[PDB]
Design an enzyme around this catalytic site. Structure first.
Site, PDB file in Angstrom:
ATOM      1  N   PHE A  24      11.813  65.319  15.954  1.00 55.49           N
ATOM      2  CA  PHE A  24      11.165  66.060  17.050  1.00 55.49           C
ATOM      3  C   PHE A  24      10.437  67.333  16.465  1.00 55.49           C
ATOM      4  O   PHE A  24      11.050  68.122  15.804  1.00 55.49           O
ATOM      5  CB  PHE A  24      12.306  66.390  17.994  1.00 55.49           C
ATOM      6  CG  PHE A  24      11.990  67.341  19.137  1.00 55.49           C
ATOM      7  CD1 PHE A  24      11.581  66.814  20.395  1.00 55.49           C
ATOM      8  CD2 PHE A  24      12.335  68.724  19.037  1.00 55.49           C
ATOM      9  CE1 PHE A  24      11.427  67.669  21.529  1.00 55.49           C
ATOM     10  CE2 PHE A  24      12.136  69.628  20.124  1.00 55.49           C
ATOM     11  CZ  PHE A  24      11.687  69.097  21.395  1.00 55.49           C
ATOM     12  N   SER A  92      17.077  62.890  12.048  1.00 57.17           N
ATOM     13  CA  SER A  92      17.266  63.749  13.242  1.00 57.17           C
ATOM     14  C   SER A  92      17.066  62.998  14.560  1.00 57.17           C
ATOM     15  O   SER A  92      17.766  62.042  14.776  1.00 57.17           O
ATOM     16  CB  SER A  92      16.304  64.914  13.194  1.00 57.17           C
ATOM     17  OG  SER A  92      16.934  66.000  12.517  1.00 57.17           O
ATOM     18  N   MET A  93      16.058  63.368  15.365  1.00 59.75           N
ATOM     19  CA  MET A  93      15.757  62.520  16.551  1.00 59.75           C
ATOM     20  C   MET A  93      15.387  61.148  16.072  1.00 59.75           C
ATOM     21  O   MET A  93      15.678  60.188  16.787  1.00 59.75           O
ATOM     22  CB  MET A  93      14.585  63.067  17.403  1.00 59.75           C
ATOM     23  CG  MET A  93      14.357  62.217  18.684  1.00 59.75           C
ATOM     24  SD  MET A  93      13.046  62.941  19.793  1.00 59.75           S
ATOM     25  CE  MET A  93      11.467  62.505  19.051  1.00 59.75           C
ATOM     26  N   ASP A 193      24.328  71.891   7.707  1.00 57.97           N
ATOM     27  CA  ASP A 193      23.090  71.593   8.409  1.00 57.97           C
ATOM     28  C   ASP A 193      22.996  72.659   9.500  1.00 57.97           C
ATOM     29  O   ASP A 193      23.890  72.731  10.327  1.00 57.97           O
ATOM     30  CB  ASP A 193      23.169  70.140   9.028  1.00 57.97           C
ATOM     31  CG  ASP A 193      21.898  69.692   9.746  1.00 57.97           C
ATOM     32  OD1 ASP A 193      21.178  70.548  10.332  1.00 57.97           O
ATOM     33  OD2 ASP A 193      21.524  68.462   9.695  1.00 57.97           O
ATOM     34  N   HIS A 223      19.203  70.447   6.507  1.00 60.74           N
ATOM     35  CA  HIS A 223      18.806  69.482   7.547  1.00 60.74           C
ATOM     36  C   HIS A 223      17.707  68.502   7.127  1.00 60.74           C
ATOM     37  O   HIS A 223      17.838  67.254   7.375  1.00 60.74           O
ATOM     38  CB  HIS A 223      18.404  70.190   8.886  1.00 60.74           C
ATOM     39  CG  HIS A 223      18.007  69.223   9.953  1.00 60.74           C
ATOM     40  ND1 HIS A 223      18.902  68.294  10.483  1.00 60.74           N
ATOM     41  CD2 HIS A 223      16.808  68.955  10.499  1.00 60.74           C
ATOM     42  CE1 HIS A 223      18.266  67.528  11.352  1.00 60.74           C
ATOM     43  NE2 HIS A 223      17.005  67.938  11.424  1.00 60.74           N
TER      44      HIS A 223
HETATM   45 CL   LIG Z   1      14.818  66.221  15.710  1.00 63.67          CL
END
Ligand SMILES: [Cl-]
Ligand SMILES: [Cl-]
Lengths: 245, 246
Positions: A24, A92-93, A193, A223
């Site tokens: 994202f 992540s997303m 993270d 991250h």
């Molecule tokens: Cl994300």
């Protein structure tokens, strides 16, 4: 207009394919090294640009979780044209879309590699922006949480406030789909993270129905692990995981 | 569109203390009418809104979103604030997740909340597989009337419109993530046995809110639509008691 460096990667090789998804506010730049690594081993590789990403923040503000899940489906269809066997990985997303696709289409993937997947953000401030009638249009950006020095991510320098509900929705749907995931899984999570809680890796390991699973902790990345000190290790482990499933 | 007979909202102007009453997903104010009338007979100002896309047609609900429903709760809050100095909110299922959402979103605004069988975590893989499914049917079989008392009917749609499902899960997740921000007094009302929303939702709320004043009330004789069920009287009585005392 696509920002320079944020273009998608479509490479055609063998009948084993990999879908690679960024997260994202980010773009395919954060996944490029990995994507290139798979194409170089001879795999077909789709690294799409998600709707409203790599263009402007305003475009993203108007984008939704239905767009993003449709982007993953569209990329799965591009791979099924070229390929008999599919894997998916994502950051992540993009890691939550990975879990979501494997629960959603349980028989379709030979394996998944979610990386720092964002199922639970665990943030009351973030949740307080999802439907706030009095919120700014934008906040400061989520980008470049990277341990290695001097390394840059191409991601928006701000967070578009209307898009926030859609992050939280994709994560929630993927978490509820966990027991339906049955394909082999290599769950890669940074031990430290500052964007997505590390506990998300345990959450996934503990909730999926997969009989073949491993939780791999990254010791030298934060991250954005795909651009970080452990990027090469991610590629090596993922290539071995593909080769064996 | 025409509102279905029986699905009309209830607005009642009374004292300076007001109660926002929210029904849930595919339901309508009728399931909350007994409670809402109770608060109005006690003299309180009462807003029991009809959510967007509800008590009209399942097709209109298919086009309705979580932005619509939270905006409905915001406009009912604005209507109550015009008429009232003190606000409470209660609600059933998604309306109880909305009650948690509004107390977390506007942490100083409410004097107390009473979520009833609040739908924060559905914990259903089958439901989650309908959220973004490019091959799903337009409609499924309905969720209406999980009610222990024999004979009792709920006015809810006879089908679940598939596209609206993603919004149910979104509201529940946003509410869950706001829990630490909820600080007002809370009466969390949960059916001990519930075939729609997992009962453990009451524990989840009790353990996650930042409120120093909180009670978990377990209902021994009702299923999901408790506001219509054997325990409806107990819920009205304890909710009225809770309002007077906060
Ligand atoms: Cl994300
Ligand atoms: Cl509901």
């Amino acid at each position: 207009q696509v920002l320079p460096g944020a273009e998608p990667l479509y490479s055609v090789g063998s009948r084993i394919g990999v879908l690679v998804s960024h997260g994202f506010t980010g773009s395919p730049q954060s996944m490029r090294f990995l994507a290139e690594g798979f194409a170089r081993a001879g795999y077909t590789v789709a690294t799409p640009r998600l709707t409203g990403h790599g263009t402007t923040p305003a475009e993203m503000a108007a984008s939704t979780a239905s767009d993003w899940t449709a982007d993953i489906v569209a990329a799965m269809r591009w791979l099924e044209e070229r390929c008999d066997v599919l894997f998916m990985t994502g950051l992540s997303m993009g890691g939550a879309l990975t879990v979501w696709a494997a629960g959603q289409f349980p028989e379709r993937f030979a394996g998944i590699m979610p990386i720092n997947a964002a199922l639970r953000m665990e943030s009351p401030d973030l949740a307080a922006l999802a439907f706030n009638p009095d919120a700014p249009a934008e906040l400061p950006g989520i980008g470049s949480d990277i341990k290695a020095e001097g390394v840059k991510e191409l991601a928006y320098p701000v967070t578009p406030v209307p898009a926030i509900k859609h992050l939280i929705t994709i994560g929630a749907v993927a978490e509820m789909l966990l027991p339906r995931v049955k394909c082999p899984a290599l769950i890669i999570q940074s031990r430290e993270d500052h964007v997505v809680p590390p506990h998300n890796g345990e959450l996934i390991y503990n909730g999926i129905g997969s009989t073949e699973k491993e939780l791999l902790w990254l010791e030298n990345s934060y991250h954005v692990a795909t651009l970080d000190n452990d990027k090469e290790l991610i590629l090596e482990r993922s290539l071995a995981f593909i080769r064996k499933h």
